[model samples]
Target chain A: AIKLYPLKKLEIILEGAHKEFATDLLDRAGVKGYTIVGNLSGKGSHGMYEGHLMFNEDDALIMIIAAVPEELVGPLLEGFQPFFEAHSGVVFVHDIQVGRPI
Target chain B: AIKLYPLKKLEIILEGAHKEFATDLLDRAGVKGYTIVGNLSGKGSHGMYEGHLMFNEDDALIMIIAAVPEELVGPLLEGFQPFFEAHSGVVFVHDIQVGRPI
Candidate 1:
C-alpha cells in the first residue's frame, strides 16, 4: 500500500470572478477536488458587508482546496502569482493528513 | 494532545442513495469527520443539467471531509470500490491542512 499524505489548504477572500476559472486552475494544478461556500458577510480590509450585497453587488470569497505531494508546495504557491496581482485576496496554507495508499 | 491531520476529502456526484452509506463509509475508513453540501446542477456522462431540474432528476452532489491517519487511504478507497459498481459516481482525494493537535 502506498502512503498517503495530508494536503495544504489555501483560502482567499477575493472579488467574485468566473467560477470556471477557479475550478480550472485547481484541476490543472492537480487538486483532487474543492468546494465553494458562499460567504454571508464579513469585515475585512474593505470594511463590513453582507452576502446579498457582496455576491450581487460584486465582492465574493473563494476557498480553494488542493492535495499535493510535499514537493509540490513551492510550485503551487508560485502558481498563485497570477491571482495575487489582479484581485484583493489573501492566501494561506494549512496542513492535513489523509488516508490513502498510492 | 493528539495531533489532528486533515483527512482526505472525497466528493461524489451520485444519485441519492442513503446519506448513511457515505457517512458510514468514511467512519469505517477511519475518517475523523466529514461534511455534505447540496449541488445545484452539473454536466456529466449523461449531459448538462440544472440543480432544480437535477434535484428532481434524482442527482445530487455530496461533499465529504475526512481526517485520518496516513495508513488508511488504501482501505478507504477499496471500501468505496463497491459504490462505483452501482451508482454513477466518481471518487478522488485531495490534500488539506487542518489545525488540530493529536
Candidate 2:
C-alpha cells in the first residue's frame, strides 16, 4: 500500500486578465509550483467565455490548480480574498491526499 | 443568501496520449460538458513534462476539469480505475459547493 500525504488542493478559476496577479500571489506565498491552464472557456455571471477568441488570451478564462501544505492555505486564501470580491470568479478548497514517499 | 449545491470536482491529469480515450469515457458517462487544456507541462514518475513540446501536443501533459453531480461519481471512477493501472496519472475527487440559484 502507498502512503498518502494529506494536503489541501486550492483550485481557482477566473478571468485571464488577472492571471499575473494570481500567480504572483502563489509565488509570494512560498508555493513550490503551480499549474496554469489558459485558453479555457467557461460560464460566468456576465456571459459564456469564448476561450478560443483567436488568441486574445486576456478576455478568456484561466484556471490555476495547486496542491499545497496546510500552512500555506491561509496566505493563499487571504491574497485571493480581495480579488474574488471584485471579480466574477470562484475558488474551492478541498481535502486531497497525495502519494509521495516519506 | 445564495443557495449552495454539493457536487464532486473530478480533476484528472494525464499524458496527452490518452486524452481521447478519457474524454470519450466522460462523454459516455453522460457528462454535459468538460474543460480540456492541452499543452500542459507537469511532473510525473517517469520524467518532467515540457508542456511546450514545440507543437507536438501528444507528448505533453493534459488536464481535464469537470463538475459532476453525485450520481455520476461512481461510473466515472470505475471507468478510470483500469486506466490508472496502466498509466502514470492521477484522478482526484473533491467536495465542492457551487453557488447556484434555487
Candidate 3:
C-alpha cells in the first residue's frame, strides 16, 4: 500500500512585487521551500485584480504557494504580520496529503 | 482581538484547458465556490510550463484554490480521482485560518 504524507500548505496572494519580500520572510523564518505560481487574478470586497496573458512584476494578485510542516504555519504567519498589514494580501492554508513527506 | 476562521483549503493544479472541467467537477461535487487564479507556470516532473504574457488555453499549469468546510474535502478529492489520474496535474491542500468563515 502507498503511504500518504500530510502537510500544512500556506498560500499567500500579494502585489506581485512583494514576491521577493514574501519569499524572504519564509527563508528568514527557516522554512524549507515553496513554489511560486503565476498570473493570479481575482475579485475582492474592494475590487478586482487582473493577472493575465503575461508576467507582470506588479500583478495585483501574485501567488506564492508553500507547503510546510504543521508547526511552521503559526510561526510563518506570525512573521508575515508586518507584510500583510503593509501590503494588500490574503492568506490561506490547507491540510494536504502529499506523496512526498515534508 | 480579531476572530479567526479555520478551514481546509483544497488546491489543484492542472493543464490550462482543464479549467472548465475542474470547475464543473467542484460544482457538481457539492463543493462551494473556489478562486481560479490565472497564468500559473511551473516546472514539474513532466516539464516547465509557460503561463506568461497572456492566456494560452493550452498552457501547462493553472490553479484552482478553494477554502471549504473541512467536511467537504473528502468528497471533493474523491470526485477528483478520475480526472487527476487522467490528467497532467498536481494537487495540494492547506489548513487555513481566515477572518471570514467559509
Candidate 4:
C-alpha cells in the first residue's frame, strides 16, 4: 500500500500585476509556502495572452499554487474573498495526495 | 446557472532540466496547451532549492500545469510513464471547473 497524505491544493490564476498581492495573502494566511508559474498562455474574455517570452510581463497571467492541510481552507479563501471580487481571475480547490516529505 | 465546464487538471513538478521533455510530451499527447512556473522554492528529498533567482538555471525546479478533458488523461499519463520512472518529480490530478472559453 502506498502512503500518501491527503490535502487541499489551491490553484490560483490571476493577473501578473497582482502576483505579489496574492502571495502576500498566502503568507498572511500562514500557508507553509507556494509555487509560482509565470509565462502563462491562454485565452480569456479580454484576449489571448502569449505564453512565450513577451513584453506584457505584468499584464500577462500567472498561476500560484499551494498544498495545505484541510483546516486552512477557510483562512486561505477568507483573504482572497475580497480580492477576487475586485479582480477578474480564478481559484480552484481540490483533494490531493502528497507523499511523505523528507 | 453558472456555466462552468468540468475538466481534469494536470499539475506536474519536476527538475528544471526536464521541463522541456515534459512539455514536449504534452504536445505529443495532444493537449491543448500548458503553463510553466519557474523559480520554484520548496524542500524536497534532495534538500532545499531556493526559489529566488539563482545561477543554477537548469538545476532548480519548475512546474507545468494543464487542463484537459477526461478522455485525454490516460493518453497524457501514458506518455509520462517512462519519464517518471527515470526522474524524480510529482504529479497530481483533480477535478476543476473552467468558465466557458472565450
Candidate 5:
C-alpha cells in the first residue's frame, strides 16, 4: 500500500501563450512543484483550440497541475483569476492521494 | 457568477505510447468529454519526463482531464488500476465546480 497525502491538486488550463507566466504564477503563489502538459485541445464558449489531433501552438492549450496545501487553494485560485477571466481558460482543483507528504 | 456543478475531474498522466489506450480507457469507463495536453514533463519515483524544457515526444507525456459524475469516481480509478500497475503512470481525481453538468 502507498501513503496517501491529504492535499489539494490545482488543475489550471490556460492559453499556451501564457506559458511564460505559469511558472511565476505558481512560484509566487507558493507552489512547490507543478506538472504541465502543453499543446492541448479544448473548446470554450468563446472559441476552440487543438493539439495532437490538430496542431496549433498559437491556439495551443496547457494544463498545469499542482499539489498544494488546502489553505493555499483559495488564494491560488484568486491569483489565477485575472488570467482566466481575461482569457478563455478554466481553473479548478480537487483532492489527490500521494505516495508521500507534499 | 457562474453555475457550480459538482463533478470529479480525473487527471491521467502516462507515457505517450499509451495515448491510444487513453481514449479507449476513458470511453470504456464512461467518460463523456476529456481535455488532453500532450508533451508534459514530470519526475516520479520511477524517473522523469520532459516537455518544452527538454523537447522529447518519445519520452513525451500526456495529461487527460475529464469531468465526470462523482459516483463514477471509484469505478473509474479501479478501471485504471491495471494500466498503471503495468506501467509507470499516475492517476488522481479532484472535485471541480463547473458552470454546467458533466
Candidate 6:
C-alpha cells in the first residue's frame, strides 16, 4: 500500500464580504471544494461579541483544505491578497493527513 | 511589508436554506467579503442542537469577513433580515489586524 501525505489546511479569519472572493481564490489555487463553518465569536484586537447575539456586530472564521504542492502556498496567499488587504481577516497554514495523494 | 489594519469580522449561526439567500444578502451589503464554514454542531435557544448527525436536521454555520468603514455594519445587519426573524440564529462582530493597507 502506498502512503499518501496529507493536504495543506488553511484557516482564515475574514469579515462579511462575499462568498465569491473565497471560492474564487480557492478555485484559482486549484483547491477542491472546501467546508465552511459559520457562527463563530472571539475577542481579538477588535472588542468582543457573541456570533449569535446582535446582528449588527459580528466576525467570521473560515477554514480551507487542499492537497497542494509545496510551491503553491505563495501563489495561494497572493491570490488571497486582495481580500486580505481589503477585508478584516487573517490566514494560517497547516498540514493535513489524507488517504490519497490528491 | 506595509502595516494593514484588519476589517471587521462577522460570525453567524443559521439554519440551512438556499445558498443563494446567503450569497444575495452579502452581495447587497457593501461588505467587500466574507468566509464560510459548514458542518458545525451546537446547542442554542431553539433547543439542544447537533449538526451532521441526522442529515435531516442540520444547521449551517456561516462566517462573514468584511472591511466596513465603520458605517456599513449596520446596513449589512439590516440586509440580513427575513432570515434572522424567520430562522433560529444570531450574528456578531470584532476588529482585526493585517499587514497591507486594505
lDDT (Cα, 0-100) at A64 in candidate 1:
46
Of the two candidates 2 and 4, the one with more favorable DockQ, higher being better, is 4
lDDT, candidate 6, residue A15? 48
Clashes of 4: 1
Of 2 and 3, which scores higher on lDDT? 2
Off by over 4 Å in 6: A1-102, B46-57
lDDT tens digits by residue: candidate 2, A2-41: 3345678877778778878987888777765566666776
Residues A1-102, candidate 1: write the lDDT tens digits. Answer: 434344555553455464576656656766544444444234344422232122224455544444345666677667765765554554556554443324
- Poorest lDDT segment (10 consecutive residues) of candidate 6 chain A: A47-56
Stronger candidate by TM-score (1 vs 5) = 5
TM per prediction: 0.49, 0.53, 0.53, 0.53, 0.53, 0.44
Ranking by DockQ: 3, 5, 4, 2, 1, 6
Off by over 4 Å in 5: A1-3, A45-58, B1-5, B10-34, B38-64, B68-102
**Model 1, position A102: C-alpha lDDT score:** 42
Better of 1 and 3 by TM-score: 3
Candidate 5 residue pairs that clash: A94-B94, A94-B95, B57-B60
- Give DockQ per model, in order: 0.12, 0.13, 0.21, 0.15, 0.19, 0.05
What's the distance in Å from true for residue A87, model 3?
1.4
Of the true interface contacts, each candidate retains a share of 0.04, 0.16, 0.32, 0.19, 0.28, 0.02
Error of 5 at B56 (Å): 21
* Worst window of 10 by summed lDDT in candidate 2 chain A: A47-56
For all candidates in order, the CA lDDT equals 0.50, 0.67, 0.64, 0.67, 0.64, 0.52
* Candidate 4 Cα outliers beyond 4 Å, as residue runs: A41-59, B1-10, B18-60, B64-89, B93-102
Tens digits of per-residue lDDT for model 3, A1-102: 567888877777777777888898989987788898666664332111222122223446667888888777767766766555545566676677778433
**DockQ-based CAPRI category assigned to the predicted complex of candidate 3:** incorrect
User: DockQ score of candidate 6?
Assistant: 0.05
At residue A99, candidate 3 shows an lDDT of 80
Better of 1 and 2 by TM-score: 2
* Candidate 2: tens digits of C-alpha lDDT, residues B29-65: 9998889768665432211122211222234778788
